[PDB]
Symmetry: D2
Subunit: 386 residues, 4 copies
């Protein structure tokens, strides 16, 4: 039961299971993992593919010979296992040069370097099959108010993304960009801190159709937001190009717990939404096996991400298929929410005395929404106690 296979589209970053366990107050607890080992182990667990930052695959500062070698061993592992690479990204955050940003660094020469580093890796991503290229502007932001003029920084961010869009267009590449929001950490405040801010920004790019979001469960939860709601807004906009699945225990540092951990009911509602919307993209885990774990715990935690998705998928499907739930949804007027409010138009609404002058507000007010009964059916289904 609940055994993943490649059909389930589960993917993992090299940096997830490969995290050595260094944290702000601690040294590594595990050795570096060879990307080849990660591809093989994830394939054996039932994954569909892996993702990478440039610098996870090729050590920063590698010579061209070393680069080619690292790429060849990785491609051979992919080819041997049938593992795919649906997404890639750039590391614009680890090296000290990026201490004030990549695309929005105050130093212009750093901004140009950030773009060149990104473009090099776009070319590699395309060759390996990535259809989405993620940008996580983790260093874009500030600890203090005058350090960053945010309007001007947004000009530089737009310029950078427009330059990347011109590049991909000129090369004829079939790849799209996905902006991954995060509200803070490692900057005191990060630019484009939520799904909303990223969606809004995209609409001022030159070629908005080339850009979407890569929301992460834990990141929206670091702002105390409802992740399923934000995903719904991204889906409504047509912009859910990729997703990062994990867990987070509230408003704190970015934990990157395995999926299912943290806010379990939000994980349930997320899976319910992805499945009923027909999301077709990768089910990507951006998680960290806690540094308490040895390598065997790394693979257990990775397996748990997939298992939890599959359990939740089963429970959500059972919830929506239950005739008692379909009745409760009617009792709560979820069907009526889908009716247009005023397809008859403004003049007909204005002339309709049943909408105002003769509307019995007290009788309407007295009608309960029946949401608690509906939610307890949902609880029962999640818990297998339906």
């Amino acid at each position: 039961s609940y055994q993943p296979t490649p059909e389930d589209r589960f993917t993992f970053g090299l940096w997830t299971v490969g995290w050595q366990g260094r944290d702000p107050f601690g040294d590594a607890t595990r050795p570096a993992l060879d990307p080849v080992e990660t591809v093989q182990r994830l394939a054996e667990l039932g994954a569909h593919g892996v993702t990478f930052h440039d610098d996870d695959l090729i050590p920063f500062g590698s010579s061209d010979t070393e680069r080619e070698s690292h790429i060849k061993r990785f491609r051979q592992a992919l080819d041997a296992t049938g593992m795919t690479v649906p997404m890639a990204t750039t590391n614009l955050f680890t090296h000290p040069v990026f201490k004030d940003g990549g695309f929005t660094a105050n130093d212009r020469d750093v901004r140009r370097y950030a773009l060149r580093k990104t473009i090099r890796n776009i070319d590699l991503a395309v060759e390996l099959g990535a259809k989405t290229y993620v940008a996580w502007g983790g260093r874009e932001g500030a600890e203090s108010g005058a350090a960053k003029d945010v309007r001007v920084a947004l000009d530089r961010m737009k310029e950078a993304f427009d330059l990347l869009g011109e590049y991909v267009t000129s090369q004829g590449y079939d790849i799209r960009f996905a902006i991954e929001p995060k509200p803070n950490e490692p900057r005191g405040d990060i630019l484009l801190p939520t799904v909303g801010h990223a969606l809004a920004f995209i609409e001022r790019l030159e070629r908005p159709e080339l850009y979407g979001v890569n929301p992460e469960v834990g990141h929206e939860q670091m702002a105390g937001l409802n992740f399923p709601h934000g995903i719904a807004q991204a889906l409504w906009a047509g912009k859910l190009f990729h997703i990062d699945l994990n867990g987070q225990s509230g408003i704190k540092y970015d934990q990157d717990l395995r999926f299912g951990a943290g806010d379990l009911r939000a994980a349930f509602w997320l899976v319910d939404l992805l499945e009923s919307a027909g999301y077709e993209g990768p089910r990507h885990f951006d998680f960290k096996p806690p540094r308490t774990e040895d390598i065997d715990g790394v693979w257990a935690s990775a397996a748990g991400c997939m298992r939890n998705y599959l359990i939740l998928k089963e429970r959500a499907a059972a919830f929506r298929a239950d005739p008692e739930v379909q009745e409760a949804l009617r009792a709560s007027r979820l069907d009526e929410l889908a009716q247009p409010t005023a397809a008859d138009g403004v003049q007909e609404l204005l002339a309709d005395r049943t909408a105002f002058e003769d509307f019995d507000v007290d009788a309407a007010a007295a009608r309960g929404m029946a949401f608690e009964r509906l939610d307890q059916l949902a609880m029962d289904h999640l818990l297998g106690a339906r």
Copy 2:
């Protein structure tokens, strides 16, 4: 010193100083205020104008004769004092009929009522001179996951705002809408929870030019976000149609403290930004005098909102005018942030070896940003210890 006059554009909602002090665990501590008294007292304190919900000005359920009477006394007070009404809004949250929303109520008849209630008050707002009409969807959202299908709710929200835009267009009215985000309270999660989400949503309306945001200091801070940053993004988008100024002590219930209270340095950076951007709109306070206060404390707290703005304006101006600060800004490369990254374009960037192959990442990395010295000049200016 720091004496407000109407030239300063300070405005207040009737419901601010008029708050009787009822909270989730407490009865009223002050009597209801007559709108006429509020207009006169605010005028004497140096305010420029007032704002209202329909139901603050005219008691809900008033007959047409009573309505006209309430409106006439208010207009006479405005006319006598020279107080203006730059903004108005609808109460789509107090009456029990709105328990599941106005525009996104699951019951269709409630959605239609919400629109009619809004349209009636738009007509009044225009007559009184409001150029901005605020929508705060405080009841739009959910406590539980299946209660609200958010994609469908967003369809209903869009339909409602598009209907209002068709109405104002057909009447030829010179008024614009401003959506006021809030992340939660009184719903467990509110739709369009931040400035970003509201900006994003606007871009999918039929007539996006008619809609902007009315961000509130405390509301973005209820998500732990940086209010000056969010205002910067709204300004960058051309969408800061109005603002609500107040204070908030962290991630908790909506406090609506007087402006300056709560996060004082964020208040400083906000004023710095509004003044350097040339924001021309009302400086509107959406605050609650704490229920500890009697009527004399109400007016003290209102006066304090204005005084704090004026003090912060002076300090921010002194900061930006100080030659030592202008040097520190250069030292921190704020000037260089404004240079285009690659106006030379993609081919020139790709051919520029100084951007990649020959870029000395370590020398760049070693250069300090000097942000702490800059921020301590800012601190010194705020504290008057420059």
Copy 3:
């Protein structure tokens, strides 16, 4: 399955199911409930008892004749159903007189009134059978820094609790006090904001044995704290005299969702802890049926509180009984945590070279904790997918 009976010790405040739905932005959505109706309906659902504030049972300002009448009808309902009253409390928060506090009001005459109001209700509580008397100092605190000298306020709080302890001692009453922490709301910050602060304060009372805590799930979660951990510390101290069970969706206003809602895995770990510790007190729900609900939804939500406890109890028991979990606990050294570190004492520890000079830190470091496998067994048990 999961049918509550009085043996399960479930109790509810009159103010829970009796909440009329007034919130900071909304009028009542339900009529007032007669306490007699609440006793009868809860008894039919399988509850064991009810709790009350003075002013829930007897309207504030009732004459002595009216008081006696309200008490008699309630006692007759209790007597008819076999419902108990294990806890009572005072309302020191609704009336405007308490706007700056009860026991720590700056006005001395208010502090004295608060004590008299409390003592009157202690006498009633004892007659009705309450063994715990809760104090929730919801108005004790401040919105601003100089309004409340906290050291002096703590002196007044101690004086009040010591006076109450002298009263109960002199009357020979068998009742204990339980302080209910909350971090904020309705005050900007509330004194004794967490379980820890309340436990600490108790140790400086004259008769500390008479005082414990009444922690509430949602209140500790309003500080982002781990409720099971705080309960563990209260149990460790011998101070878990009562508990309030509910749900909360993060760091925000006090939601008082039904138990099980909000942080579901924290609800699981809480039940696991209460059951393995042998907590014998009431399983009391301090919740609000959302104001979306009519009366039928009130009773559904109340029933859901009890059902969720019972489901979680079953899952937690199954988890701890599973041989695979008992093995995983050993693999993770939970057994070894219970061994004394150094029962051999300080001189033997200092002379033990295996504790320092000859301790192989790297071999110890390399041993994984196996916590992820353990936690995934816990997840599987919660979800019924063991």
Copy 4:
């Protein structure tokens, strides 16, 4: 103006200005600092002393010869500058051996090692003059619910602290312990997460008089708590043995901004409280110069910590000395808060009809607290606009 000198008691950890800038997503941005250089630079800035973890002063794993060398160079620098060492602590968090804790590690051999490591450094601390020995249990806690039995962990924590108290007592050392709370990070939840929880725990130690708290501004703010209030409770308990001063911008990762940054008004109220209470201990900064900074920015940020304390001290003194503020305090009944509520005792209170039967609740309720006027005087003083 605002020039620190040793008389001001300012101290800094070696790890503060010595932070190399590694964060969870970034490599070091600055070179390691020699402790000798730190002592000399801080002395030149006007500091009084420095603090250390064992492993900041002596590299982990140093041979006895290397240890003695590191200690000698440091003592020579101290001796040359007149810099003191008022506090020391153990690093029980960086090495991978401590991945599940020191004193509460599930592995018993790790717990014993943690104690030996601590005892070795106590002996050094005493020699160097430390009068306070801090314990920060940053690894004590869990990411998952079954990983740590908190009651049993508290038994192990108590055992460890009792063993340390027996050791210091047997050696005759004049040193006290201070527990530094933090709610989370690097563990998902940390044991003893707040000042309150630590104060409570101390009262169950064998020799409670030997233990107090070392609260940190940012740590209490990571739980959204009021730091001045928590300090007031620690002072009220007689347990403020040391303090860590810094800044924090809300509920997020531990930022360790320079003091004054983050919540500026809380910094003001903190200084007001420390000065009026007569706190005599070190004014210790536990801060991180942001990794954006080079070495010159390190010393600017360190200097800014001290400058901000001194500015705030001046403003707080001016506030309390202002006759207008002393009148406002009376208007707000801060004087009356200091009067005993019922020194006349319980029988006299019960017989006093002015406390209940004849108390005019409405007249009392109608009296405003005048807190807003008081707080605006405080604002004016902070801003130098009095």
